[PDB]
Amino acid sequence: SITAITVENLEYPAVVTSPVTGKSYFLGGAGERGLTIEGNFIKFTAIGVYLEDIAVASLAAKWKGKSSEELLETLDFYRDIISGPFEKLIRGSKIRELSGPEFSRKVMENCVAHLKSVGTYGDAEAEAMQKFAEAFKPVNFPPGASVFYRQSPDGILGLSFSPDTSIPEKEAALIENKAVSSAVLETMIGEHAVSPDLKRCLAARLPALLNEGAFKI
Ligand SMILES: O=C1C[C@@H](c2ccc(O)cc2)Oc2cc(O)ccc21
Hints:
The chain is of the alpha+beta class. The chain has helices at 55-63, 68-72, 76-82, 100-117, 123-136, 178-189, 197-205, 207-210, and strands at 5-6, 11-12, 15-17, 24-29, 32-37, 40-52, 88-94, 98-99, 140-141, 146-152, 156-161, 173-175. It folds into 2 domains: 55-83 and 189-212, 10k-s Protein, Hypothetical Protein A, Chain A, CATH 1.10.890; 1-54 and 84-188, 3-Layer(bba) Sandwich (Chalcone isomerase). Strands 3, 4, 5, 6, 7, 10, 11 and 12 form an 8-stranded antiparallel beta sheet that branches. The chain has a two-stranded antiparallel ribbon with strand order 1-2. Substrate binds at residues 45, 110, 187. The record marks 103 as: Important for catalytic activity.
């Protein structure tokens, strides 16, 4: 019942299965991110957000029987996606070649931004971020190079890099800090995430599922 999304010739499948935790996610929504200089928006990377199947049953708890327009203006609904008792997978596939650090910089930027936004950015979180950046250093992402973030409900972030848009088998690293976990996703679909790219998508495709209250295969 669920379909795919190509964002600037970078395709995001309808479903996916982690070689790491054998879970199976569904494309919640795709989108793209980039920079705005001189009123021009140059897109650098595509972005798709995946939710584990067990997410429908969970969100159905309070979001079923509501429509796109309705959820889209509801913040809680997102705090629920980002902090849901389930794994979320976020895949960023480059549109413009960026190095590990060049990129890991903008990302780490909005993160700490939020961490302080809610008084969670302390020593531990700080080390976790150091680590976060130590992971991206050896890397580089020419177009098609994907980064895979696994946000585990157990308060862990699974970092894994690729030269193309196919998920790797093993992971680059694991950042074990509950805060830093949600961070990424929060910076993309959170309250303070200006772009309605991911938000509109999620708001549009989930009710279709939420009406059945289940998911698997
Ligand atoms: O998916 C991206 C792209 C990234 C980025 C854009 C332009 C650039 O030059 C380097 C990195 O910024 C981000 C910041 C975030 O908090 C979350 C996701 C992203």
